[PDB]
Ligand binder design. Structure first.
Ligand SMILES: Nc1ncnc2c1ncn2[C@@H]1O[C@H](COP(=O)(O)OP(=O)(O)NP(=O)(O)O)[C@@H](O)[C@H]1O
Ligand SMILES: Nc1ncnc2c1ncn2[C@@H]1O[C@H](COP(=O)(O)OP(=O)(O)NP(=O)(O)O)[C@@H](O)[C@H]1O
Ligand SMILES: Nc1ncnc2c1ncn2[C@@H]1O[C@H](COP(=O)(O)OP(=O)(O)O)[C@@H](O)[C@H]1O
Lengths: 659, 410
């Protein structure tokens, strides 16, 4: 019913002048490639840009970056009308202007700097009144098309004289900034972002629905993670994204107010968020305001939490507010905010994976002229355990470096601090090398969630167990119905005991690869020691970030390290682990100091043990002449590389009771 | 609302509680319900305040001030005996405990049913199923589920169909159905993580899941199957029934599946307090947590208690379980089972007034029949499982394997 209309979705191609559809739709709409389309959005707007194809598009959702989307006064979810519009004629005169707030500080001629680079061989269809963004000179510039000759919309051709006077246009009310915290600004946090998104989607963008309805719509949204994971952003952006009024509550701020005035604030906090509703009240650094754990010692520290819990209930479904809190971990927060009616929806944000950090890194360089030798992916690679902040700060450092070298030293000619300068000012792969080898690479590490990369290629011999695990996992994850035709239910865990350097680990990380499910490597030394004292509570937390990161396979290497608390605790959270969910559990030199209970059912009821020393030499020199296991292959790669520096091709020089 | 009553200026707090009763004593009969009390009156070791102390008082000053003629029944909701101040327990204040607990198999169903008495559930919505896989949830958990699952429907079908237009009206929601795929989504979320604890269920397993050793089988039925159905037949001899029994021996022997069974023949609940568990996964220094167990024990009667893996641990925990063992009103349905190391076992536990009954655990030929019942026609289970597998893995590759799988103390 009404084919020409489709639901706006985020864009894959960040290029302003393009909207991409799915092929079947485009044929249904007699649309080709270079095809120029017309777009009628909300508030009576029209945005004529170019349409393309896209395999991951929806047969009814038109992908489109925020520019083309704000130029329609549309949010993500609203549906627009597309219509082929090939009757556009090469402009003649394109009189434009910069929104006075993206230019405050840049001197010189904009045109030459941002305009020309922008249009040169693009022919970007443009329509009178469109606000488009240009990233150059190490920042962002918003330009408003004031008057276009082939009116309304024309195609900026090479012969279309593009005028630019000198009276930056004041930013009109409704024309929200494009420099605004957006979805496109958050990277690496895909799957979980996607979760915040649906929770609010309904109550936040479809208000009335919760009037003609009587259903419990989340109110409190808690975000977990370590400082710099990007909660604020993910927050300010989901609000800035769905047209909600965003009202912030900086936790340290709310404490730095006279003993009492504190309250009044939180109250106005909600008293103002309940005004412009839909609205998201974001409590930043909550663990500072409401940490009623064993740090709760105060005649006023207690009144505050109350006052907030008195409001974290006071809000009715009709209020149209979704309160979002950002704490660090289950224990930083008061166990009373967990009540069902307050902050009941946890969303774990975590450390960005290999790909993440890249996106992230990419996201913060969308302005600086990176060099041809800047392999951002590289930067992403050697940075193993960083968070957003760490990664962003890096781009600033690395960047400032450029500016600290080339430019001001060249002060000698003079101080032309202008556009053309920053514009051509490049940041080479040596600027990141400097930024990285600093006093900032020291990132606050913790337990990471990655997607196993190693397959069965890095494990030779013992192919006995290999064809076994694939049956307790490679079948209940891809073949769900084949496991309801027998009656029996899958195992919750398994155990791998034996001598060191045997293969257990490289196997546990492997088994997950064949299921594309994450992994969690909780080393033995580690829970007890390097984490937090008396942390039988830290253990339940592990499972939280475990069952949540599903599909996944858990693995506690070196279980012999430790019926005591820790063990018994890992055992308790082992039974309460919703079996009917993707939460596998591996185990790990001393089958004696091992509590038999761990051997017992409902836990590690599976018992395994670890030709071999002939093929484990092939998968140990693959990426490495043609004539403990690795303790030798390494003493060779060395005497082999030390023999060259002194022709890349050594060895002679290197040379059951329990079962 | 307890947090509410604390979030008021140091002092105004009182005035409230007073009007609280000053208004409830007006429209009386009336029930003054103190929500989240453990926040107001937790005079346990968290009682550190020149004002935290005045409040509790002020309330205890009223929790007495009320006369029979007042016509008010004050109801408090706390989490456990220790969350509350031991002074509210005085006879005259809050003296009547009513333990609400985690909903059993049937419960969760009703519950689930109760929150869908409005949404057009689909013909393929087996609510009982939802009830089944959700083992340890509470009301909230279960309700929140219906909302999630529900919103799901509304988040799919409807607004996507925004394309026609936004007719948010009755006929829409009316025909808007919530399928068994909406609950599948709601369940496989970040909410199924329910706050588990010790549950009270009605043993389902009978004597069918235990073959061999029918010696003890015809024994327990005499210390329970007779004093629960035949009360007078136990006052015609003089002797009084045993308060407990003990089952020691090698692993995977049958003790547990027996303790849960013995209760089934009496339709009496059961409580499985695993060994690792009291000490570890509960709360530290919890010789007080142990008396609590008996509280939720004698209360859930008729019932049979069972501490599996007693060898895990005269120390506190044990001695404590022993103390609350004598003070356990014998003239009430409070049986007590026990549970690989008859050495690290304090003889006192062997002694009378406790586990004066001592038992030990054909067999490995019939324990194979009750292990393949609901499962060809040509440690005990450590094999029957390696078979059901190589049997189902042999099909995915026709539902019918084995060859492939293959006293000092007494
Ligand atoms: N099957 C294998 N294939 C390739 N390399 C292996 C294999 N087994 C052991 N290694 C090498 O031996 C070292 C120990 O590897 P790993 O398998 O990760 O530990 P582990 O045997 O599981 N540890 P542990 O639990 O203490 O016995 C590594 O540096 C590997 O390169
Ligand atoms: N009599 C029995 N009938 C059927 N199955 C049994 C029997 N005894 C043991 N099993 C199996 O053995 C495993 C251990 O069962 P269970 O009887 O519950 O423990 P237990 O012997 O009481 N434990 P423990 O106190 O450590 O010796 C289970 O998976 C059962 O299926
Ligand atoms: N996942 C990410 N992708 C891109 N940028 C990120 C991400 N996480 C953090 N950042 C950047 O790091 C900084 C940290 O932001 P913020 O959300 O406020 O931190 P916090 O998690 O402490 O609240 C921001 O300026 C943001 O742009």
């Amino acid at each position: 019913n009404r084919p020409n209309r489709l639901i706006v979705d985020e864009a894959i191609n960040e290029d302003n002048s393009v909207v991409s559809l799915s092929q079947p739709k485009m044929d249904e709409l007699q649309l080709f490639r270079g095809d120029t389309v017309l777009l009628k959005g909300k508030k009576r707007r029209e945005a004529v840009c170019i349409v393309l194809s896209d395999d991951t598009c929806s047969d009814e959702k038109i992908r489109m970056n925020r520019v083309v989307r704000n130029n329609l006064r549309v949010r993500l979810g609203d549906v627009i009308s597309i219509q082929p519009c090939p009757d556009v004629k090469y402009g003649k005169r394109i009189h434009v202007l910069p929104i006075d707030d993206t230019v405050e500080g840049i001197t010189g001629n904009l045109f030459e700097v941002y305009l020309k680079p922008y249009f040169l061989e693009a022919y970007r269809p443009i329509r009178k009144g469109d606000i488009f963004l240009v990233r150059g000179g190490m920042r962002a510039v918003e330009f408003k098309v004031v008057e276009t000759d082939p009116s309304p919309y024309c195609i900026v051709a090479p012969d279309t004289v593009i005028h630019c006077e000198g009276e930056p246009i004041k930013r009109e009310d409704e024309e929200e900034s494009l420099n605004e915290v957006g979805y496109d600004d958050i990277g690496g946090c895909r799957k979980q972002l996607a979760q915040i998104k649906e929770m609010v989607e309904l109550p936040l963008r479809h208000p009335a629905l919760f009037k003609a309805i009587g259903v419990k719509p989340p109110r409190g949204i808690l975000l977990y993670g370590p400082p710099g994971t990007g909660k604020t952003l993910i927050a300010r952006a989901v609000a800035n994204e769905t047209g909600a009024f965003f009202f912030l509550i900086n936790g340290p701020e709310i404490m730095s107010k006279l003993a009492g005035e504190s309250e009044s604030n939180l109250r106005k906090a909600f008293e103002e968020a309940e005004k412009n509703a839909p609205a998201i009240i974001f409590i930043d650094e909550l663990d500072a305001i409401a940490p009623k754990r064993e740090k709760t010692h105060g005649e006023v520290e207690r009144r505050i939490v109350s006052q907030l819990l008195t409001l974290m209930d006071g809000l009715k479904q009709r209020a149209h507010v979704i309160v979002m809190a950002a704490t660090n971990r289950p224990n930083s927060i008061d166990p009373a905010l967990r009540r069902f009616g307050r902050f009941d929806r946890e969303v774990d944000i975590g450390i960005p994976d290999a790909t993440g950090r890249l996106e992230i890194l990419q996201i913060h360089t969308k302005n600086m002229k990176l060099a041809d030798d800047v392999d951002l992916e590289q930067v992403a690679n050697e940075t193993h355990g960083h968070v957003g902040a760490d990664l962003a700060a890096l781009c600033s450092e690395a960047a400032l470096q450029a500016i600290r070298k080339k430019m001001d030293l060249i002060d000698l000619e003079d101080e032309t601090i202008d556009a053309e300068v920053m514009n051509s000012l490049a940041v080479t792969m040596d600027d990141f090398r400097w930024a990285l080898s600093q006093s900032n690479p020291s990132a606050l590490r913790e337990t990471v969630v990655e997607v196993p990369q190693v397959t069965w290629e890095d494990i030779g011999g013992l192919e006995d167990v290999k064809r076994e695990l694939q049956e307790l996992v490679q079948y209940p994850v891809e073949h769900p119905d084949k496991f309801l035709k027998f009656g029996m239910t899958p195992s919750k865990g398994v155990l791998f005991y034996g001598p060191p350097g045997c293969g257990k680990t490289l196997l546990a990380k492997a088994i997950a690869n064949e299921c594309q499910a994450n992994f969690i490597s909780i080393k033995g030394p580690e829970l007890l020691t390097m984490w937090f004292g008396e942390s039988e509570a830290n253990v339940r937390e592990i499972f939280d970030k475990a069952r949540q990161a599903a599909p996944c396979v858990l693995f506690f290497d070196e279980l012999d390290s430790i019926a005591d608390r820790v063990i018994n605790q890992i055992l308790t959270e082992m039974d309460g682990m919703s079996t009917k969910k993707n939460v596998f559990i591996i185990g790990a030199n001393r089958p004696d100091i091992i509590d038999p209970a761990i051997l017992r059912p409902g836990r590690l009821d599976q018992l395994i043990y670890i030709k071999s020393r002939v093929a484990i030499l092939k998968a140990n020199l693959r990426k490495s002449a043609k004539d403990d296991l690795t303790e030798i292959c390494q003493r060779a790669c060395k005497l082999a590389i030390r023999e060259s520096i002194e022709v890349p091709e050594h060895f002679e020089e290197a040379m059951e009771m329990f079962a």
